[PDB]
Amino acid sequence: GLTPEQIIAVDGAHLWHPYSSIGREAVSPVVAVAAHGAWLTLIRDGQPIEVLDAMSSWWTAIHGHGHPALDQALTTQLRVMNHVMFGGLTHEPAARLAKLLVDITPAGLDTVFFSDSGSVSVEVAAKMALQYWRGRGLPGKRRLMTWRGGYHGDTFLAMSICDPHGGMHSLWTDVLAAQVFAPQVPRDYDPAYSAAFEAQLAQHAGELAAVVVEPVVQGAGGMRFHDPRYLHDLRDICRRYEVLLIFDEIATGFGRTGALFAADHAGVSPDIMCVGKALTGGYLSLAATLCTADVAHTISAGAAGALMHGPTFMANPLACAVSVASVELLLGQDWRTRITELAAGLTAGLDTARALPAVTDVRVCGAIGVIECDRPVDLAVATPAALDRGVWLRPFRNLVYAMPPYICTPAEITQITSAMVEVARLVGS
Amino acid sequence: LTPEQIIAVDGAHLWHPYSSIGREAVSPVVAVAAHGAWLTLIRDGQPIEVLDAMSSWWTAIHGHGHPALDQALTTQLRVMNHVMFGGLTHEPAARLAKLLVDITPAGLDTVFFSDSGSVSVEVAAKMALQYWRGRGLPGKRRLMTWRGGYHGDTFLAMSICDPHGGMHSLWTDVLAAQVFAPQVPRDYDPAYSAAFEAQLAQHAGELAAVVVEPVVQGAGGMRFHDPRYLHDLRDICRRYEVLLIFDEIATGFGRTGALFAADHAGVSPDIMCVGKALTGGYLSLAATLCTADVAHTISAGAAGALMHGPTFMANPLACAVSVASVELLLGQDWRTRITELAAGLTAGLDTARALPAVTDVRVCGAIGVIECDRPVDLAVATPAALDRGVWLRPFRNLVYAMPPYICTPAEITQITSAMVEVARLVGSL
Numbered sequence: 001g002l003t004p005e006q007i008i009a010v011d012g013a014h015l016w017h018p019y020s021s022i023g024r025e026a027v028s029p030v031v032a033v034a035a036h037g038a039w040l041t042l043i044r045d046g047q048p049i050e051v052l053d054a055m056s057s058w059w060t061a062i063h064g065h066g067h068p069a070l071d072q073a074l075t076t077q078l079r080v081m082n083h084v085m086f087g088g089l090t091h092e093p094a095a096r097l098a099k100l101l102v103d104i105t106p107a108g109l110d111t112v113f114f115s116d117s118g119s120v121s122v123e124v125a126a127k128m129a130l131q132y133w134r135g136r137g138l139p140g141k142r143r144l145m146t147w148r149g150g151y152h153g154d155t156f157l158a159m160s161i162c163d164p165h166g167g168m169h170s171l172w173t174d175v176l177a178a179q180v181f182a183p184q185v186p187r188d189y190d191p192a193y194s195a196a197f198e199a200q201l202a203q204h205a206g207e208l209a210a211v212v213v214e215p216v217v218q219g220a221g222g223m224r225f226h227d228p229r230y231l232h233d234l235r236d237i238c239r240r241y242e243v244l245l246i247f248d249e250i251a252t253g254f255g256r257t258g259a260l261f262a263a264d265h266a267g268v269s270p271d272i273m274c275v276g277k278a279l280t281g282g283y284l285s286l287a288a289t290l291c292t293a294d295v296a297h298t299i300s301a302g303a304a305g306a307l308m309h310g311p312t313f314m315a316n317p318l319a320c321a322v323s324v325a326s327v328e329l330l331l332g333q334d335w336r337t338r339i340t341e342l343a344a345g346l347t348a349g350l351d352t353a354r355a356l357p358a359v360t361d362v363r364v365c366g367a368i369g370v371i372e373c374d375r376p377v378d379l380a381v382a383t384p385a386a387l388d389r390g391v392w393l394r395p396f397r398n399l400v401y402a403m404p405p406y407i408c409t410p411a412e413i414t415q416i417t418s419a420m421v422e423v424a425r426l427v428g429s
Numbered sequence: 430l431t432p433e434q435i436i437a438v439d440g441a442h443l444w445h446p447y448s449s450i451g452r453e454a455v456s457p458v459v460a461v462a463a464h465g466a467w468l469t470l471i472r473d474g475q476p477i478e479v480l481d482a483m484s485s486w487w488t489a490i491h492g493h494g495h496p497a498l499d500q501a502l503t504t505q506l507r508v509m510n511h512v513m514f515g516g517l518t519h520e521p522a523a524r525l526a527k528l529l530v531d532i533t534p535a536g537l538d539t540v541f542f543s544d545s546g547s548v549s550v551e552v553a554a555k556m557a558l559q560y561w562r563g564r565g566l567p568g569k570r571r572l573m574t575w576r577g578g579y580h581g582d583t584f585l586a587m588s589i590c591d592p593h594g595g596m597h598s599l600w601t602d603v604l605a606a607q608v609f610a611p612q613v614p615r616d617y618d619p620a621y622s623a624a625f626e627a628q629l630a631q632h633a634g635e636l637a638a639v640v641v642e643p644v645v646q647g648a649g650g651m652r653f654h655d656p657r658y659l660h661d662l663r664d665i666c667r668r669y670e671v672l673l674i675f676d677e678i679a680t681g682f683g684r685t686g687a688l689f690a691a692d693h694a695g696v697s698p699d700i701m702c703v704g705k706a707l708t709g710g711y712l713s714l715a716a717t718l719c720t721a722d723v724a725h726t727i728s729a730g731a732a733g734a735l736m737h738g739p740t741f742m743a744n745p746l747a748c749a750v751s752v753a754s755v756e757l758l759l760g761q762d763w764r765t766r767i768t769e770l771a772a773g774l775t776a777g778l779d780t781a782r783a784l785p786a787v788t789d790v791r792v793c794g795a796i797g798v799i800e801c802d803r804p805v806d807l808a809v810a811t812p813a814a815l816d817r818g819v820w821l822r823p824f825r826n827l828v829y830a831m832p833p834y835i836c837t838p839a840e841i842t843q844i845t846s847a848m849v850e851v852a853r854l855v856g857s858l
């Protein structure tokens with residue numbers, strides 16, 4: 001047992017936080033004491049208050065926290081089998097989830113490699129790509145190409161394809177692998193951009209294993225949207241120059257952008273696909289990398305004879321079982337209508353912010369709404385402002401944005417957007 | 430799904446650790462339950478109870494379905510499944526960090542949670558690199574280790590795995606080129622330390638850290654070495670200003686007969702990794718610890734923060750079960766328990782020394798190893814162990830067990846007996 005003041009003291013002395021310091025934090029983290037449905041209970045001024053989880057706890061809690069169908073799924077699997085090692089053994093949660101995932105992902109993705117986090121699945125995807133070409137007799141095809149503004153995780157190979165500014169690649173001189181970056185993909189469809197991308201790829205094609213991109217929505221590198229037709233062009237470019245196509249859908253997966261997977265907006269299939277954040281409905285760390293049969297078999301007929309990867313908790317029965325329920329719960333409802341209503345709620349709620357002086361853009365894609373500002377957002381002001389309106393918001397750089405749980409009612413969206421609009425109002429003054 | 434349906438889905442759609450698709454010499458065995466030290470597996474259409482001699486890849490130290498860990502999981506499930514750790518903190522993270530800081534080797538004061546051992550190793554290297562950049566020495570960017578080690582499957586972690594065990598021939602031009610000392614011997618030889626120092630001297634100015642598994646090298650070959658090499662590593666790292674990283678992902682939480690294997694030598698590293706048994710084998714979770722000095726130096730450096738933050742960082746569910754797991758270990762007389770486990774393994778395995786295909790028998794804590802004169806054919810060893818009521822997973826030429834701590838004397842003798850028979854069959858044919 002610990003009181004919130006003891007939690008804060010232990011935290012200050014011993015807990016790293018994401019991209020944080022020890023002992024140089026501008027403001028203490030806020031003690032969370034509960035989380036239920038779309039709502040978190042936080043400690044402000046020593047008192048518990050309920051606020052909306054407008055971030056879905058970093059894209060994860062698509063069905064809300066403590067959903068009874070996913071609680072029960074975890075409690076049911078807990079009674080039979082917490083976990084078994086996946087070396088030499090298999091089980092029902094893994095098979096059911098793999099069945100579900102191959103069926104609902106874009107066509108052609110037939111095999112599923114489970115891991116523990118999104119960064120790992122990305123490295124698994126890269127390893128798949130590199131082993132694929134070795135099994136084709138082309139070990140020179142070993143670099144990655146991407147477009148600027150992306151984000152793919154914090155492990156060192158993943159870092160190498162993150163946006164060089166967002167990723168502070170200047171601080172990693174002579175450390176990261178040197179990958180090929182095309183310019184920032186634009187919002188509106190411009191075929192000249194795809195032509196330029198093709199030309200740059202063409203001169204690297206013989207050393208490129210793969211193109212890796214987030215489809216439609218670029219999350220942590222800047223909450224930028226692009227026309228899905230760009231994905232159509234990458235597919236055709238990759239096919240023509242014999243470079244594999246990897247879609248990182250770790251933030252876009254499972255309905256978040258209006259389609260079940262963002263690749264579906266373009267009607268295109270990658271050779272390799274990563275999923276993660278929402279996979280367990282925000283309960284537990286789990287990820288997966290999927291590839292075509294051709295990739296699977298080429299790796300397996302490779303001289304190495306196998307994919308050299310195997311996380312200790314691979315295909316954890318507890319995380320697979322809740323993920324099964326999370327996916328079935330999503331497919332078991334009219335999810336497409338649900339996201340459309342959420343998008344319309346966000347569009348209506350944030351429209352006020354366009355006319356505000358400090359706002360350069362307001363954009364919505366499925367259950368994602370963004371207010372882009374003309375200067376950094378001072379969190380020391382934005383966080384108390386949103387809390388006083390009962391909304392948990394976490395701006396970064398010049399972005400005030402939300403990815404709310406799918407269960408948010410119209411009133412809760414209106415509360416979330418009103419808080420975002422007000423945060424943007426204070427950016428001016 | 431039935432076992433047969435699971436088998437069909439699995440063969441079609443699941444990757445397994447370091448495996449192929451559709452080229453598996455053996456099918457996986459369907460596991461349907463796990464309780465205490467026992468797995469329920471399906472063999473010839475029938476369920477059987479077998480001992481989990483591997484502890485499900487060295488994780489299930491308290492056995493499966495321990496009431497204390499089950500309840501800690503359901504209790505946390507009732508209040509809060511997960512919140513984002515960016516901007517927020519919570520009780521299971523604070524308690525777990527206070528626990529780990531208090532029981533790890535002295536001076537390890539800060540805790541970075543992540544979701545797997547591989548990621549925690551990348552976090553450690555990132556800490557070491559950002560540390561020296563904080564000190565104005567950004568040329569200290571390489572790693573040194575001794576051959577025979579294993580540290581995970583992500584690409585930085587791969588770079589310090591044994592260049593044969595990790596098939597580094599298959600990963601040249603891709604992996605960072607690290608500094609490898611020869612295989613550390615089992616008996617203490619002061620000359621090996623002298624040569625290690627001499628090699629490290631020729632690289633000090635480009636070395637960020639020495640990274641080793643302490644006392645026991647797990648996946649690279651279940652090799653033991655004398656603890657006093659860790660004393661020499663500590664002193665050499667001290668005099669040459671190279672940080673010391675201990676990877677205790679396999680050795681932590683009592684496995685080798687001390688709480689952490691570093692304690693066999695009284696040594697404290699600068700950075701420490703833990704993972705496998707951290708949650709008692711329930712959920713994926715890992716932690717990287719470092720000293721106040723490393724943390725304060727990173728935090729005062731150019732980035733002002735450690736450049737890392739996993740989506741599920743400090744997952745309340747995983748942390749809560751780990752709290753229970755660590756407290757359950759601390760609140761019993763674990764040292765006597767592991768001492769008794771080790772005696773049972775030693776007495777039970779002694780008879781294998783005389784088998785013709787056996788080259789060594791060695792025990793260290795709750796770890797027992799029969800080294801054979803040839804690679805062990807899993808198609809012979811697996812059914813033969815299952816015939817004896819034991820789940821065994823040999824690799825390379827090693828028949829070994831890492832049994833759950835709750836194994837009674839008779840269960841240990843049942844485990845060692847199956848291992849002895851497996852080794853007897855190796856020299857038969």
Ligand SMILES: CC(=O)c1ccc(N2CCC(C(=O)c3cccc(Cl)c3)CC2)cc1
Pocket residue numbers: 018019057058149150151162163164165166167168220221396513514515516738739740741742
């Ligand atoms: C779970 C949680 O609460 C959480 C909060 C924040 C968070 N970050 C912080 C900002 C980071 C960032 O901008 C960035 C870093 C490297 C490359 C690029 Cl392109 C962008 C991205 C991750 C991760 C997790």
Ligand SMILES: *Cc1c(COP(=O)(O)O)cnc(C)c1O
Pocket residue numbers: 117118119120122151152153154214219220248249250251276277738739740741
């Ligand atoms: C969050 C994220 C990752 C990394 O996921 P982790 O589980 O934090 O490693 C990778 N790619 C994308 C697109 C993401 O949004």
Ligand SMILES: *Cc1c(COP(=O)(O)O)cnc(C)c1O
Pocket residue numbers: 310311312313544545546547548550579580581582642647648676677678679680704705
């Ligand atoms: C098992 C292990 C790892 C990898 O942990 P994962 O969770 O499987 O990534 C790393 N280092 C050591 C010493 C290990 O035993």
